[PDB]
Design a protein around this ligand. Structure first.
Ligand SMILES: [K+]
Ligand SMILES: [Mg+2]
Ligand SMILES: [Mg+2]
Ligand SMILES: [Mg+2]
Ligand SMILES: [Mg+2]
Ligand SMILES: [Mg+2]
Ligand SMILES: [Mg+2]
Ligand SMILES: [Mg+2]
Ligand SMILES: [Mg+2]
Ligand SMILES: [Mg+2]
Ligand SMILES: [Mg+2]
Ligand SMILES: [Mg+2]
Ligand SMILES: [Mg+2]
Ligand SMILES: [Mg+2]
Ligand SMILES: [Mg+2]
Ligand SMILES: [Mg+2]
Ligand code: NA
Lengths: 214, 144, 203, 215, 98
RNA sequence: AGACCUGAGUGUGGCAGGACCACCCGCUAAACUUAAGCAUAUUACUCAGCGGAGGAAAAGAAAACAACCGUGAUUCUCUCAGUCAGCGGCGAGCGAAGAGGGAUUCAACUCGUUGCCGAAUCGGGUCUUAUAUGACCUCGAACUGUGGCA
RNA sequence: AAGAGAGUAGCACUGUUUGGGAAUGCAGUGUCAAGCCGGCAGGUAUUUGUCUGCCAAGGUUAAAUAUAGAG
């Protein structure tokens, strides 16, 4: 709040053959008599300084938030929309993809990689691996040095049994009890590739309800 | 967002829509509601006729919890009944009992055509409402 | 007991005998210094009522203050600005003389802690109060569970911050409820509460 | 040009905004999610330390004042002395076994007292009350088996001992009698209301009429 | 035994029906009781110190027979009509008992 | 010649003084500005000035609300509420409180006074591994009342 | 069986402060209580009679709160 205004500056007035901008007092510094306090002056105060009570956050209606999550889920069941978003699902047996519950008992990362290759989901994780690169612009100076694309998302009935799937680059884990719209539609575009476990798949009817049953 | 404002469209117009004559100066006509009876009189009299002056008695230390008294009409009573109980209420049979206090109502008014007989518990009631509910086949029970 | 007779006698300050005693005492006080140390309080029943005990570490002083209103210290009586701010002789101080006597003793003897005070005498130009003080470094004070709370550093110069009985009086803290809503924690704290602009995260 | 607008009363004429010359007077809530985590962490730590005591002490049930909230019930500050005497517990002792005591509250009714007495009797039967020293147990103290079989109440309201608040039940559907179908309820209510409203005017009329009887 | 209420919102004894209970005794009710020992102590002191200049003026007015003027004098000094009436009664008693 | 009261000198053991001052407590205290002029009003019980603490400070245990089917120390938050409360050249403008949902909460104690006792108290010295809430001594303080019980 | 804080509370004048309006709080001076039918409060002034809630003029006290140019 004090930036650019910590000077005892004053306008010289008219009759001295100079502009009427405020000028710095004193002498013997090469700064004396220079312009001050103006948004057009060097070392001056900026126009409309930014404040911290700007409205950073937003409110959204509860029903509208639930509407968006439902719509983004229905889009993930259409293979045309999945391909249009950018995922590689040419080797996937069926959409939506549902696998057995045994993947929760894995403990070694090698087992997870073998499972991904079996169901044909390894093409998408390979696409994310190759896309890794250094960000362009000032962003690489602000703790955002690397960028990468979004791969498949694996949905589990709870927040357990994820030790073997963590550390795999290009894979995301989700909990069916709290689905995030920021993950279901990255960048605002629908059609994310989702792999379901059987236990999590069977809970969808109870969590969201039907057209007649609440 | 700053990219939808008129200022983006006005880059290069030199006047931003305020005119070569007249210009954009600071506080002509004064600040706030100044001049309500001098040089702004026509606006005030035309749009806010009852602004200047007093009216009525005063009430020191008003407690609005003492005057709480919401109202409901006779024609909206079925919105409080059970979803099943209506449509099978008859003249001389068992009838649902509605408590207005538990639903947040104080006085029962008598507008409209009653749709089903019932027994209503209320604090206050109008004379027309009492007549209509009695004719239909219901009753009013006073509660405090 | 004997307290009742002493208490009821001091409720007759307008009687002939009490006026005679006070008149002689006022003449004696007029010829002493502004601050005087006493061996014993002149109103022992009143002193014990406000927290004095006959024990080592307790002391009593008598302090003199000048009666009348306040005069604004403006050169030659000239005030500037709007006429609403004029006037040099008719305005009054916002704290009472009882607390002015306490603060004068406290600022003079910095090794003591002021406890309370009470009224003693008055005349046409002077007022006299007696102040009870405690020495916090004494062994008997530090080992007494009823008074050792005053040793803690949070009670330093409590009379300069208006925390005594006299200071509470002019702050409005004798009142409660609807008579003290705008000054109850403190006048400044209430003003800060009612005037700060609040920004919720999701407004 | 001003048109047809509301007259503004925005109330922003003091120095609240921080600038180069003013400190300002503002309050923001950027610490809201961090403080939410901190309060939960402290509650969890306190529960671990005081185990197995319940987090919340027992409290009574009271009626909300004013006609607007006449029909509601909530939790009070502490149990009254008359309630404690009826239950059979001393006030000072009751404070050591997690019962809140309020010496200012008065009953004024029997329905309220009976509810709160029942709460105390239910709680006293469910108490365990570990002995002071295990080697020598006193009278009315839980044995070792009850001590090891002990859990901690975590309910935010201490209802695991007694339960929720108690209100009268709703009325079932019934049949209308014939006094109910003939009585005029507005006539009955209005007459009672008028007795209080015109008490003074009626008294003056009677006094003047009585004064005209000096014969 | 407080009066039981009716069941309606208006009229005399209005309100919801309960079972009212009598007020409990308290230690605050010891006020308004006579204070015999306090009264006796005040009598001893009043004997010792005697009268005051204000009380002598009221004494003279009562002797002449100006009761209304005595009340006006007392009310100005004490600031309350109830306080003034108590002061006049006290002086009347003392004169009678002397 | 000797006590008591009041008042000095010296000696022994201690404390105060300055800094920091964002937040907090007490005092003192403007004008620019707005009112399209201006004097009451507003800016504002704010800036400048003086004094005083802490890790927080201040407040706190009803001479409180309410008028109900009644609540129950303090502090803070949403709301009550920019108020069909109220103040104001009734102009410009200003402006709270009870109640309700919550955060916190095993939260409360005490002196004087009244009644029964009447140095049982404090300081100093010595002893008990101990400047003990212990014991003994003390023409030291204290009956112009320190302590203990209700 | 007793008692519970007096130049204190109140009142008048003057000044200031408050949304507080026949006077919300406070300060100076004058005057100055009650407690064998007590005192204070109950948001329009006075006198009289009821009802309701509390019992001033001494003291200590964690947590939930601030850090708007500090360490
Ligand atoms: K006085
Ligand atoms: Mg500057
Ligand atoms: Mg710069
Ligand atoms: Mg123009
Ligand atoms: Mg022109
Ligand atoms: Mg913080
Ligand atoms: Mg200093
Ligand atoms: Mg410091
Ligand atoms: Mg300005
Ligand atoms: Mg102007
Ligand atoms: Mg001008
Ligand atoms: Mg300052
Ligand atoms: Mg403190
Ligand atoms: Mg203001
Ligand atoms: Mg008292
Ligand atoms: Mg304190
Ligand atoms: Na102008």
């Amino acid at each position: 709040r004090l930036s650019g205004m910590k000077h005892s500056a004053e306008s010289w007035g008219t009759g001295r053959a100079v502009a009427r901008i405020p000028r710095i007092h004193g002498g013997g510094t090469s700064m004396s008599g220079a312009g001050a306090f103006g948004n057009m002056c060097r070392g001056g105060r900026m126009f409309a300084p930014t404040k911290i009570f700007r409205r950073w956050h937003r409110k959204i209606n509860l029903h509208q938030k639930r509407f968006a999550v439902v719509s983004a889920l229905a889009a993930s069941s259409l293979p045309a929309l999945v391909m249009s978003r950018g995922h590689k699902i040419e080797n996937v047996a069926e959409v939506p993809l549902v696998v057995e519950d045994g993947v929760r008992a894995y403990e070694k990362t090698k087992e997870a990689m073998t499972f991904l290759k079996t169901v044909g989901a390894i093409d998408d994780v390979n696409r994310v691996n190759d896309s890794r690169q250094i960000r362009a612009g000032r962003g690489k100076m602000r703790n955002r040095r690397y960028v990468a694309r979004r791969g498949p998302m694996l949905v589990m009935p709870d927040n357990k049994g994820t030790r073997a799937f963590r550390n795999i680059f290009g894979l995301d884990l989700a909990n069916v009890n709290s689905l995030n719209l920021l993950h279901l539609a990255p960048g605002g575009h629908v059609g994310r590739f989702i792999i379901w476990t059987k236990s999590a798949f069977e809970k969808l009817d109870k969590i969201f309800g039907t057209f007649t049953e609440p | 967002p700053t990219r939808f404002k008129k200022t983006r469209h006005q880059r290069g117009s030199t006047f931003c829509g305020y005119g070569r004559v007249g210009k954009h100066r600071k506080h002509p006509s004064g600040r706030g509601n100044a001049g309500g009876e001098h040089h702004h009189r026509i606006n005030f009299r035309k749009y806010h006729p009852g602004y200047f002056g007093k009216c009525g008695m005063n009430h020191y230390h008003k407690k609005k919890n003492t005057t709480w008294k919401p109202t409901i009409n006779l024609d909206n009573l079925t919105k409080l009944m059970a979803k099943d109980e209506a449509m099978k209420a008859k003249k001389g049979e068992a009838l649902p009992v509605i408590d207005l206090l538990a639903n947040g109502y104080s006085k029962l008014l008598g507008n409209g055509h009653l749709q089903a007989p019932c027994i209503v518990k209320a604090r206050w009631v109008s004379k027309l409402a009492d007549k209509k509910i009695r004719k239909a086949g219901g009753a009013v029970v006073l509660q405090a | 007991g004997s307290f009742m007779y002493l208490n009821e006698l001091w409720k007759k300050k307008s009687s002939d005998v009490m006026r005679f005693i006070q008149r002689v005492r006022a003449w004696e006080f007029r010829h002493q210094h502004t601050i005087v140390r006493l061996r014993r309080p002149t109103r022992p029943e009143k002193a014990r009522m406000v927290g004095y005990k006959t024990k080592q570490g307790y002391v009593v002083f008598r302090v003199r203050v000048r009666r009348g209103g306040r005069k604004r210290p403006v050169h030659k009586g000239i005030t500037y600005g709007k006429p609403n701010t004029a006037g040099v002789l008719g305005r009054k101080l916002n704290k009472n003389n009882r607390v002015v006597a306490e603060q004068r003793l406290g600022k003079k003897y910095g090794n003591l802690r002021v406890l309370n005070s009470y009224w003693v005498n008055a005349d046409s130009t002077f007022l006299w109060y007696e102040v009870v003080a405690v020495d916090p470094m004494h062994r008997a004070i530090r080992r007494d569970p009823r008074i050792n709370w005053i040793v803690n550093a949070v009670h330093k110069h409590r009379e300069q911050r208006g925390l005594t009985s006299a200071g509470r009086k002019h702050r409005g803290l004798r009142q409660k409820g609807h008579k003290a809503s705008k000054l109850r924690p403190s006048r400044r704290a209430a003003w800060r509460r009612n005037n700060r602009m609040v920004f919720l995260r999701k407004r | 040009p001003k048109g047809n607008n509301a007259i503004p009363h925005v109330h922003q004429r003091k120095h609240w905004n921080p600038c180069s010359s003013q400190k300002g007077n503002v309050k923001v809530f950027f610490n809201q999610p961090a403080q939410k985590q901190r309060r939960r962490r402290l509650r969890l730590l306190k529960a671990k330390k005081i185990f197995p005591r319940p987090l919340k002490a027992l409290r009574p049930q009271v009626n909300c004042p004013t006609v607007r909230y006449n029909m509601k019930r909530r939790l009070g500050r502490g149990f009254s002395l008359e309630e404690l005497k009826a239950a059979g517990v001393k006030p000072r002792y009751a404070r050591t076994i997690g019962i809140r005591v309020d010496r200012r509250r008065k009953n004024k009714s029997e329905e309220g007292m009976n509810i709160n007495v029942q709460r105390l009797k239910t709680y006293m039967s469910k108490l365990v009350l570990f002995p002071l020293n295990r080697k020598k147990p006193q009278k009315g103290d839980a044995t070792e088996e009850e001590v090891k079989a002990a859990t901690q109440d975590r309910s935010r309201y201490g209802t695991a001992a007694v339960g929720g608040l108690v209100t009268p039940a709703r009325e079932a559907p019934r049949k209308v009698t014939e006094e109910e179908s003939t009585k005029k309820m507005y006539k009955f209510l209005k007459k009672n209301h008028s007795a209080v409203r015109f008490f003074r005017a009626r008294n003056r009329r009677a006094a003047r009429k009585e004064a005209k009887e000096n014969e | 035994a407080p009066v039981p209420r009716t069941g309606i919102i208006a009229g005399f004894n209005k309100g919801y029906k309960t079972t009212r209970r009598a007020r409990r005794p308290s230690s605050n009710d010891r006020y308004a009781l006579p204070h015999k020992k306090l009264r006796a102590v005040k009598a001893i002191i009043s004997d010792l110190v005697g009268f005051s200049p204000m009380e002598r003026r009221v004494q003279e007015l009562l002797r002449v027979g100006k009761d209304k003027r005595a009340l006006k004098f007392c009310k100005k000094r004490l600031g309350s009509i109830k306080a003034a009436k108590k002061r006049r009664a006290k002086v009347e008693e003392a004169l009678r008992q002397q």
